[PDB]
Amino acid sequence: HQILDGKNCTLIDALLGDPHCDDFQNKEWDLFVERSTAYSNCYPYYVPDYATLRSLVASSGNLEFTQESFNWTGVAQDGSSYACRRGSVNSFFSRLNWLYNLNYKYPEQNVTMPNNDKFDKLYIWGVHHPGTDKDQTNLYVQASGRVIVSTKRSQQTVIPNIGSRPWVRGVSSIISIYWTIVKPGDILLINSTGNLIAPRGYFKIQSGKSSIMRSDAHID
Amino acid sequence: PWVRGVSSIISIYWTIVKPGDILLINSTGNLIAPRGYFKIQSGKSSIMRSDAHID
Amino acid sequence: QVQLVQSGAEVKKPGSSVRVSCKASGDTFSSYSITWVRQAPGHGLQWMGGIFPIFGSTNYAQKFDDRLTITTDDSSRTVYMELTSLRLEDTAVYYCARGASKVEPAAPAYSDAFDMWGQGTLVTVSSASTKGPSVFPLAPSSGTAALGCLVKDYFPEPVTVSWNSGALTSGVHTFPAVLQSSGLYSLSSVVTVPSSSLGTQTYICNVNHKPSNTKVDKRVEPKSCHH
Amino acid sequence: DIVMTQSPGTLSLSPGERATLSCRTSQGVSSSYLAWYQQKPGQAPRLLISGSSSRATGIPDRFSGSGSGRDFTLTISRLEPEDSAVYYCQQYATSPTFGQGTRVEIKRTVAAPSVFIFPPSDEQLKSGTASVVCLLNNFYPREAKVQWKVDNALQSGNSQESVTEQDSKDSTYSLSSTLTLSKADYEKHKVYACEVTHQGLSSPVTKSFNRG
Ligand SMILES: *[C@@H]1O[C@H](CO)[C@@H](O[C@@H]2O[C@H](CO)[C@@H](O[C@H]3O[C@H](CO[C@H]4O[C@H](CO)[C@@H](O)[C@H](O)[C@@H]4O)[C@@H](O)[C@H](O[C@H]4O[C@H](CO)[C@@H](O)[C@H](O)[C@@H]4O[C@H]4O[C@H](CO)[C@@H](O)[C@H](O)[C@@H]4O)[C@@H]3O)[C@H](O)[C@H]2NC(C)=O)[C@H](O)[C@H]1NC(C)=O
Ligand SMILES: *[C@@H]1O[C@H](CO)[C@@H](O[C@@H]2O[C@H](CO)[C@@H](O[C@H]3O[C@H](CO[C@H]4O[C@H](CO)[C@@H](O)[C@H](O)[C@@H]4O)[C@@H](O)[C@H](O[C@H]4O[C@H](CO)[C@@H](O)[C@H](O)[C@@H]4O[C@H]4O[C@H](CO)[C@@H](O)[C@H](O)[C@@H]4O)[C@@H]3O)[C@H](O)[C@H]2NC(C)=O)[C@H](O)[C@H]1NC(C)=O
Ligand SMILES: *[C@@H]1O[C@H](CO)[C@@H](O[C@@H]2O[C@H](CO)[C@@H](O[C@@H]3O[C@H](CO[C@H]4O[C@H](CO)[C@@H](O)[C@H](O)[C@@H]4O)[C@@H](O)[C@H](O[C@H]4O[C@H](CO)[C@@H](O)[C@H](O)[C@@H]4O)[C@@H]3O)[C@H](O)[C@H]2NC(C)=O)[C@H](O)[C@H]1NC(C)=O
Ligand SMILES: *[C@@H]1O[C@H](CO)[C@@H](O[C@@H]2O[C@H](CO)[C@@H](O[C@@H]3O[C@H](CO)[C@@H](O)[C@H](O[C@H]4O[C@H](CO)[C@@H](O)[C@H](O)[C@@H]4O)[C@@H]3O)[C@H](O)[C@H]2NC(C)=O)[C@H](O)[C@H]1NC(C)=O
Ligand SMILES: *[C@@H]1O[C@H](CO)[C@@H](O[C@@H]2O[C@H](CO)[C@@H](O[C@@H]3O[C@H](CO)[C@@H](O)[C@H](O[C@H]4O[C@H](CO)[C@@H](O)[C@H](O)[C@@H]4O)[C@@H]3O)[C@H](O)[C@H]2NC(C)=O)[C@H](O)[C@H]1NC(C)=O
Ligand SMILES: *[C@@H]1O[C@H](CO)[C@@H](O)[C@H](O)[C@H]1NC(C)=O
Ligand SMILES: [Zn+2]
Numbered sequence A: 001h002q003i004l005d006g007k008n009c010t011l012i013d014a015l016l017g018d019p020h021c022d023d024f025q026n027k028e029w030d031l032f033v034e035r036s037t038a039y040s041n042c043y044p045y046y047v048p049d050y051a052t053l054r055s056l057v058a059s060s061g062n063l064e065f066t067q068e069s070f071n072w073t074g075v076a077q078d079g080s081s082y083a084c085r086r087g088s089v090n091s092f093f094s095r096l097n098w099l100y101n102l103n104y105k106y107p108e109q110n111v112t113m114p115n116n117d118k119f120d121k122l123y124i125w126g127v128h129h130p131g132t133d134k135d136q137t138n139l140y141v142q143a144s145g146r147v148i149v150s151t152k153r154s155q156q157t158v159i160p161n162i163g164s165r166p167w168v169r170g171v172s173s174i175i176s177i178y179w180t181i182v183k184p185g186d187i188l189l190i191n192s193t194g195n196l197i198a199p200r201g202y203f204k205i206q207s208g209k210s211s212i213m214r215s216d217a218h219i220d
Numbered sequence B: 001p002w003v004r005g006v007s008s009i010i011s012i013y014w015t016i017v018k019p020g021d022i023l024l025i026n027s028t029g030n031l032i033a034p035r036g037y038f039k040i041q042s043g044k045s046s047i048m049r050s051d052a053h054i055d
Numbered sequence C: 001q002v003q004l005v006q007s008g009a010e011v012k013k014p015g016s017s018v019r020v021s022c023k024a025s026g027d028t029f030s031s032y033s034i035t036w037v038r039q040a041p042g043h044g045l046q047w048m049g050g051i052f053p054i055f056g057s058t059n060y061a062q063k064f065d066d067r068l069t070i071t072t073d074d075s076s077r078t079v080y081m082e083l084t085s086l087r088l089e090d091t092a093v094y095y096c097a098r099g100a101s102k103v104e105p106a107a108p109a110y111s112d113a114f115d116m117w118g119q120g121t122l123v124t125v126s127s128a129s130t131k132g133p134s135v136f137p138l139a140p141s142s143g144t145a146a147l148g149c150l151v152k153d154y155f156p157e158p159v160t161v162s163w164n165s166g167a168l169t170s171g172v173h174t175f176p177a178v179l180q181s182s183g184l185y186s187l188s189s190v191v192t193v194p195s196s197s198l199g200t201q202t203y204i205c206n207v208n209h210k211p212s213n214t215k216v217d218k219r220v221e222p223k224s225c226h227h
Numbered sequence D: 001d002i003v004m005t006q007s008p009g010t011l012s013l014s015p016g017e018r019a020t021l022s023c024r025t026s027q028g029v030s031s032s033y034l035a036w037y038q039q040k041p042g043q044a045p046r047l048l049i050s051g052s053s054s055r056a057t058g059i060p061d062r063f064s065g066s067g068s069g070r071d072f073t074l075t076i077s078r079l080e081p082e083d084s085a086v087y088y089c090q091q092y093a094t095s096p097t098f099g100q101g102t103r104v105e106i107k108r109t110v111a112a113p114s115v116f117i118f119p120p121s122d123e124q125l126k127s128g129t130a131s132v133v134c135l136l137n138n139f140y141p142r143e144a145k146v147q148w149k150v151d152n153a154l155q156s157g158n159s160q161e162s163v164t165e166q167d168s169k170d171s172t173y174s175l176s177s178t179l180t181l182s183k184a185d186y187e188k189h190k191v192y193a194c195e196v197t198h199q200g201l202s203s204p205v206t207k208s209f210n211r212g
Helices: A011-016 A019-024 A050-060 A133-139 C026-031
Strands: A003-005 A031-034 A065-067 A081-085 A096-098 A109-114 A120-129 A147-150 A155-158 A174-182 A187-192 A196-199 A201-205 A211-214 C010-012 C034-040 C043-052 C057-059 C068-073 C078-083 C092-099 C114-117 C121-125 C134-138 C144-154 C160-163 C172-174 C185-194 C204-209 C214-219 D004-007 D010-013 D019-029 D034-039 D046-050 D063-076 D086-091 D102-106 D114-118 D129-139 D145-150 D159-163 D173-182 D191-197 D205-210
Touching (some): C034 C068, C043 C068, C078 C092, C160 C185, C185 D173, D019 D102, D034 D063, D063 D086, D114 D191, D145 D159
Parallel strands (some): D010 D102
Antiparallel strands (some): A065 A201, A096 A196, A120 A174, A147 A187, C092 C121, C134 C144, D004 D019, D114 D129, D159 D173, D191 D205
């Protein structure tokens, strides 16, 4: 059975794209092995439904990630942070897209991404919650607004809640992580007024002889 | 998502009211109201998914 | 711009290891990514791992994982490909390449179009021993006459063949090598020249086999006195 | 794993004509993550197209890129003799995958082979081997027949050969045939001939030498 040593990465850090997990991009496993030595080194985040997400990725068996052309009209892309530096360079989750002010401007976004393939798409995205109100308006002109991610089966509304969070590597703020599955013939539709940590594409999601295990045993 | 003329949606919720309890609805708008209630019990009752011909 | 410069062709036995360099420009090295891609019969093009020298960060293909290492040397602007535990099906031409888009700190594109490419490096994997070539002149005969030289019995590929240093280059056709039944290679090179020029021009075959470090010069001229 | 299937396997057109190459992918690929390459025999791949239709720096405008989803296209508006190469598509939406390649041949007015024949050198013969060479030079099409005769007797099982790839300036081919005998066998005979059959020949051509 094909073993993938998670080393210093957790399955979710490997998923999201934590800089020190770039080696895990698009990898497969019959068994993913999480080590107790693992850490995170990127923006502070919270995955409500963490355990569920970890489980469904583990039994899918791979992190095959396919990029997609989302049309983010009038908004600055590829934001980064001190909390997620690659070396001395500000970086971010390699599968997430931090949208923000472009020339002191932020328009509401309304984008769709139709699934016309023969398989299910897994979209991982999030929502940024600023520490202060100044932080809100600097990054997204507009005050706290909503994120609405809808399909023909699901519905996911998130309201950003501004407030001081626990200090993690330079930041007193946090990102909420959410996931969506889009069936063939279904369509991913994102309406966002701001605070959206956008998806860069999708994971091909399946199910099979695939799992995950926690262990510090030497793979030999 | 566009469904038959509409780009909007209704969220469905349910409530059980016990004997001696009271259903109380405060709404400032956007309410899709109940017209009454289903009598809810429990027993030799179920549901199955099938395309088998009932004969 | 850079004109990526790789190492020379190698010969390794199964179970051995290579190191194949790539020398880049300051810009290429510190603000672009470097990729390795290999090529063979039945393997049209195989993307191997890639690196962002600027971060030292990598992504490898599973096919070569825990074998392929990609390292760099910041003082020479070189990227090295160390494929270990060599297998016979690793016989291939290894190219380095540059990512077409510039480095994005929030999302290092290890998967990209490949803008500039190195010259390619043939790594031959085999347990058969290395052999330097023998060169035998193919003397001309009777407006326009062709002459050449034959490179025979060597192993492995490749071999460099030129005429009069780099001076004679138009009219030259150097052939694709054929593997002989012996397990050694044979390659011929011919050139079209004026039959009149045969009496004034010196025509020299230059052969260089870097896998054995064999360099040979052969003057090609005719004969005819007998009747 | 995104599979790239190119069409056709081989394409043969004359200069001035339009070449159309097709690429079929197993997954829907965004048109902003697809590239086209050119590879001339022995060279590294040259980036022609990136982002499906964006032309790379130093590429001629006769090269056009198109497509979406799983159906992609490369068009070469005005073929030159220099365009004789293999073409590749690549997707970069996931870890880079490439096609099997399309071989494009440029057509040329039928050209007969200039035939030459070479005896083994005395130097070679001293080793115990007697290899005999025949050159068919600068012809079109690539199809050609080479027959070796030793004292007017057809040999077989000893004659190896190879052919150069289409010339990027004059679109011709050339062929090297090698009759390998032993010195001892070479010395049993005295007449060595190379017969060439080709489209540009109204009748077959024979070149030869004597001794021994
Ligand atoms: C709501 O309530 C909470 C709790 O009261 C509060 O949270 C506090 O937030 C502040 C700022 O957001 C944060 O400040 C320091 O954070 C760094 C950690 O300090 C800790 O250091 C130890 C860990 O190493 C730890 O054991 C200690 O117990 C201590 O808690 C600290 O390094 C920072 O200092 C750097 O940054 C400031 C600017 O923000 C500079 O002025 C400093 O000089 C220093 O910069 C220097 O170092 C950096 C590299 O470290 C370098 O790049 C730079 O150039 C310079 O050399 C902060 O001072 C508190 O830690 C945090 N407290 C807790 C308990 O979480 C919220 O702020 C409250 N909300 C509001 C609106 O008030
Ligand atoms: C946020 O982002 C999303 C995506 O960009 C966007 O959603 C789009 O919403 C619009 C309107 O809300 C909707 O418009 C058409 O919807 C009907 C479906 O069009 C589909 O048709 C095929 C299915 O049959 C399908 O394969 C196609 O791919 C296509 O998507 C379409 O029939 C409608 O056209 C009728 O209605 C308009 C008025 O709304 C008339 O002007 C038309 O002439 C037409 O009316 C005619 O026909 C009807 C009967 O059909 C008849 O009664 C009438 O008298 C007349 O004869 C709409 O043009 C898009 O489909 C939808 N797109 C997606 C992908 O969902 C949101 O609108 C965005 N939000 C904002 C604020 O912009
Ligand atoms: C997974 O995560 C673990 C833990 O974070 C990493 O292990 C550490 O990796 C770092 C980086 O490679 C090592 O840093 C090296 O430390 C050596 C010793 O210095 C200290 O090491 C430990 C950790 O701080 C201290 O406890 C100890 O007391 C020492 O004070 C240095 O000798 C190294 O210096 C040079 O190393 C190389 C050149 O050889 C280059 O990086 C630099 O030139 C550098 O100057 C370096 O500083 C650290 O030692 C590791 N920890 C331990 C306990 O050894 C894993 O690397 C990481 N990834 C995996 C496992 O794949
Ligand atoms: C969901 O997606 C849709 C996609 O179009 C998006 O629709 C946009 O909504 C905004 C917000 O209502 C519209 O922008 C308005 O347009 C005009 C001028 O721009 C004005 O009416 C509004 O300006 C207000 O701003 C003042 C400052 O506070 C207010 O005090 C005052 O009341 C002004 O009216 C506002 O700018 C925009 O036109 C539409 N887009 C289209 C194409 O119609 C919608 O916002 C998304 N949902 C979100 C983000 O929650
Ligand atoms: C829950 O149920 C209760 C049932 O009574 C309901 O109480 C009602 O609340 C509304 C909202 O506060 C009250 O209406 C107010 O009454 C007067 C005049 O009508 C005004 O104070 C208010 O007008 C405001 O409107 C302006 C426009 O924006 C404001 O700018 C300005 O501040 C004005 O003050 C408002 O109309 C109403 O009186 C009570 N009802 C009773 C019987 O007291 C409550 O709203 C329900 N909760 C909801 C709907 O969330
Ligand atoms: C960009 O956005 C506009 C407005 O929604 C849309 O018409 C266009 O198709 C988008 N471009 C894409 C999807 O390439
Ligand atoms: Zn004489």
